[PDB]
Design a protein around this ligand. Sequence first.
Ligand code: SF4
Ligand code: SF4
Ligand code: SF4
Ligand code: SF4
Ligand code: FES
Ligand code: ZN
Lengths: 688, 208, 117, 123, 84, 38, 71, 114
Amino acid sequence: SNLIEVFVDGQSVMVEPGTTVLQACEKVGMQIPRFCYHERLSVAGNCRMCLVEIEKAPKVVAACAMPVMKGWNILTNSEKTKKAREGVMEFLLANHPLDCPICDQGGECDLQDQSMMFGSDRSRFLEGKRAVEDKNIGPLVKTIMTRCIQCTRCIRFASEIAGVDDLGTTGRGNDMQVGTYIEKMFMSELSGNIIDICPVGALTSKPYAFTARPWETRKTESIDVMDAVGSNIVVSTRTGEVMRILPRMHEDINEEWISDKTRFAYDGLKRQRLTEPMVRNEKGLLTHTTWEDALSRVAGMLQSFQGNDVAAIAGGLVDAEALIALKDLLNRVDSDTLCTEEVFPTAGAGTDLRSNYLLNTTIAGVEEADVVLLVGTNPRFEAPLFNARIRKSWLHNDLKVALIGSPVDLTYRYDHLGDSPKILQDIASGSHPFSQVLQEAKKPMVILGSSALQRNDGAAILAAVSNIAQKIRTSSGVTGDWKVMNILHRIASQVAALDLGYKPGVEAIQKNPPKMLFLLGADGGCITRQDLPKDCFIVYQGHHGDVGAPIADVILPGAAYTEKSATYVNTEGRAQQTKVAVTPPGLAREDWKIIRALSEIAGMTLPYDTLDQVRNRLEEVSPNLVRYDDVEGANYFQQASELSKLVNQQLLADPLVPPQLTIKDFYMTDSISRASQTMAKCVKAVTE
Amino acid sequence: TRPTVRPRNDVAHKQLSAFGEYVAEILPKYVQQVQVSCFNELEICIHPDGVIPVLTFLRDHSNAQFKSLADLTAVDIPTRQNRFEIVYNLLSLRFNSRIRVKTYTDELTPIESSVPVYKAANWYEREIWDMFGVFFANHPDLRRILTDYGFEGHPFRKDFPLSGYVELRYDDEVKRVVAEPVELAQEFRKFDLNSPWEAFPAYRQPPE
Amino acid sequence: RFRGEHALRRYPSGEERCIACKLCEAVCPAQAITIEAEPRADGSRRTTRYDIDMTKCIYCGFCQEACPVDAIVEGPNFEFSTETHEELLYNKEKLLNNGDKWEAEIAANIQADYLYR
Amino acid sequence: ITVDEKLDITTITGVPEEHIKTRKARIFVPARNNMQSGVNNTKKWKMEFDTRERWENPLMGWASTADPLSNLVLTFSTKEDAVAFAEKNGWSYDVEERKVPKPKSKSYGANFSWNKRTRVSTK
Amino acid sequence: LGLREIRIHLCQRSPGSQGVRDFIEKRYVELKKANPDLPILIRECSDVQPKLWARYAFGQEKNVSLNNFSADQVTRALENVLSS
Amino acid sequence: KFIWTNHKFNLSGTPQQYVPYSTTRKKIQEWVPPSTPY
Amino acid sequence: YRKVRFVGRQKEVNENFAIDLIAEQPVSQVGSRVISCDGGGGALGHPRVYINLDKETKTGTCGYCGLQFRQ
Amino acid sequence: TSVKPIFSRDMNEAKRRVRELYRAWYREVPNTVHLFQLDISVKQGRDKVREMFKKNAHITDPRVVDLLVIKGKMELEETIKVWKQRTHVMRFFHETEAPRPKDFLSKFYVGHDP
Ligand code: SF4
Ligand code: SF4
Ligand code: SF4
Ligand code: SF4
Ligand code: FES
Ligand SMILES: [Zn+2]
């Protein structure tokens, strides 16, 4: 029912009435040569490089953009097709410079992996070769527009997803260029992602630029942690060093796109790094030590203190395996008092079943929604790929989007509804329009961001939006279940950390003065020694030395994110194990194995040694940390929403402002952002 | 088609088609596939029980002598559910023709050795034992040829990484010449040369 | 057309004719060459390290003929026989010295023989 | 005859030294070096091993190493015969998944609208 | 101490676990109305033998295995540990 | 131009024997602790 | 730590440098639009590439050629 | 299991065959200690053999045991004769190679997870 039986190469196949010759011939396993067609873009017909000879016809058509009628004989290999592909791809290889000694796409470029397989055998021009000039765009994208097969693929990118309409087509005939007519710089998030799109060596990387050819790298897949959704990358080592990283095209997150910060931040891995254990020396001095001095040094103080005078904070980018060796060491001594760096208010729940603390509609359900309301967040500069999914789903079907607080620049036509916490209280009632379109919605979606919930009125706004999430779901609600209330984040290892059974928000240490703290937070200054009591020690365990490692007693090294098999959890409860790329330099070690040799030199010895025994200890506590990349159906929060009505805190008087600047707050955030000097070199080119 | 392209002939493509038609007709206990190579050669698949008789049928006859064993070899293939591949090869000295005998096998399943039929395959069978581990049955002399006295890997198969485990050296700690764990002074870079776009349309796998 | 000691030529007034295009290292059958480039400060790309073992060198003539910019040349002098294995490893700044001890020798050879290849 | 039917799990030992229990293998589908667009690099399940240390040889900078496996890719045809090789030699493993994209709905000529939102320019 | 918390595991389906799927409906909002100190955890899927961990006394484990109770047996088998 | 003066030699230890070395920058550049004051 | 390998070995290193020996070239001028540089003589040197010389303030040494080229 | 065996049938001819060749090696320890002019104590050479046969006792299958026989049967060609020039025999006794830690804390000082 509803298909056309179409014969490719004299062999039947059944396609929908309305597909292409391209996709139908790609169903029986053939690749016609493609230039002007990428899947995640629109379709143009401006290179004429798919030329199928359709049977019983004089003419030759483009298989990129035409429907498939009643059952043709799509005749791919003939003697008129092969006279066309060979004839089109002698044209563009004429007006073209004679590089591949020095052009940087010398390994993959598609004037080269066509032109052995398809295409001609020799050249007949024999002099000419027009030569246009280059220019600059930014300090990310080296631009040599001499090369330029003029496929108009980078230009349809900008009018699409990355909604800055900046590039164009300037000229007539052979005389045309591509780049921006005025000298405007083109820079946003997703700005460096065009250098994958560009099918020849025109757009190429600036920091990587002249280092290594791509038949030598060793691709090992991995997951990146600088952000909420995680990533899907593939690192590329040459001789034990990271050269550059790519996207990996997972079908739900990173559809094919990667974030710009996550691409150009491998320099911070190897610039300013701590390699060895260091001893106290009694002044502001702090000097290196051999590995068997500073082990029983701190392990001496464990046998002395007891009770709540020792604690630990951890809220950065460490995994969910070096956050079990901490929890079973501080709670076999029965002194828990430990929290993450991030502030998250708990009112009736929060550690138990979490009820909205994971993003309940997944990313694949965002394309199914109809009316999206979101409050208290600037979604552009935190989880940008979730923003691009809105940008896709705002197009290609209808969508209606409103926002509360702080008029900012989102690329699609939203409307600033109001700017106060009191808009939330009135929208529980019927007023201040759209007013009932949430009630008149078929698949609603109400996002709270984690930028507003960090504030002092967090227990109010948590219960306020859960009321209107209750108000919609008790009406019908949707059809249907269609989980409504949800949240995102901006710190990667929090959902991994919190669903081990920690507490949210640094409050327990904020009241009492415990003596010794372990810092794995750490660079955010929510605790200083001034807020601490006097010069009683704190022992630091990390890999960078930005803020908190100069103010420390004994520091211990660790491996960052490309050096250890780990586990991280994005905002849907997936579990994405990163893998080994480089072994960590110097005397640095893995994080969770320095804890056992802290344990075994002290009294208590933990009943697990290898990494498989660690993950069974995970499977004891949480059984969904080995169910890799699966989103189970479990909401259970009708009980939670009434029980979260227990706390009756009210709102405040302040506009829900995000921390983010025009762009400039996007670059320098976490830890690896800070030490990476290319972020330091692309930040002064913004301000000028 | 043109110059610098090999001219074929249909003479040998018809005779070697017609000849080995009746090697499957008159021994249909063993022969389970016969196919004609496009460059005028013959392959004939034989169940490993017919290792001795279909040689012995060939070994002496009036219509197919094949009295010279040119090459016994062996190929290993993971993902086949029966690993190896034993390939015999013979020469009709009266007739100027070639035919290959491709008998599949496994590790633990022995093969009846072709020692009595041809005395050429005495050394061609001690060798394959050392390089893969195929145990040829009732061999009159099975030993250790082409390897050292300490290898236990059977190295020409896909599970033995290229450099060994036993990189050797000397020391004066007594007098001896002693082994060690393997210790390279360079990585042995592994390049990547397998380029996309599926350049060969004729040999194309079924779509699935 | 004799094969022997290695060299790196350079242009009239010097440019270090190499451009680090990474082909003389991809068709050494014996994996002798070891190149690590970097964008040099002027903007044109060059080598930093260049290493040819003189023991793994099996003396093909596959470096000599893969080069587009016509730089690395098997030079015609069999003068050798050093006394330490620590020495036969070549750096970049040996080859240039060894490639500018003569170019009156080499450039008389290549001008005679480039007409065939 | 003497065909002696029974059932016992085939596990082999003796040939490597100690790398049976130390190393967990990894089976994956390779996925499309994204700087180009040809999809012949897919369609074969492979396996690949762990990575270990690479120090520096303190005379040049050659990244010398132990870890004698370090360069082994095998090409298996399917999942069904993927795991059937990690058991017969008897080492651990972990299995990835094959990912094939959305089917999907694209139509040139929908780029020009009367009241819809997909309408492109600058072409 | 004892104690600190407990860990209610279950499965989403394979309906032998259906005591907890009524126990949340009956005694969670009545259960956690009492004890506003103890952060009892709920996790995802054991898929078989839906156990119930307890953790106290310098980090020691006590695991009952309710496989298939009623809605009233799970109502009363929790205060075995909650009282103690 | 760029030709040598007269000649040279391949002298095994003259005392000069060229003794090959590495020609790169160091890679990771480890972080140094703060100063002697606090 | 590393410098002991050339104690009494004279440490033979390069003398001339071409890190910048470009600059002594009298950078050529033409008064045209695009120029060829198969520099170093025909059938030797780098392949022929056509450079645009219209801007601030030179061709760009061809990418291959090294020699400062301009109008 | 449709495959013919090598020598044995099932668990009994095999586990009398492996006890046969042990009496060969027990006899042919004190011969090679003077046939190669190697100076150790003779009880060392008997300790290595009774060490080696206990290594493989986890087998629950025939014709795998029979495969180890063929290796064990072969070595008595070279060892009882003179084909190994004093050096291929002495590789079983790892005298040169440094001791491995094999305990957790000693690995942690030296070596990135061996
Ligand atoms: S940058 Fe060059 S290759 Fe890419 S779309 Fe523009 S003209 Fe085409
Ligand atoms: S972009 Fe194409 S034509 Fe230009 S150098 Fe690269 S492969 Fe050659
Ligand atoms: S001589 Fe040629 S191949 Fe060798 S480094 Fe220079 S440009 Fe590359
Ligand atoms: S002669 Fe051959 S093997 Fe030797 S360096 Fe040149 S290309 Fe490599
Ligand atoms: S080939 Fe891309 S437009 Fe038809
Ligand atoms: Zn030039």
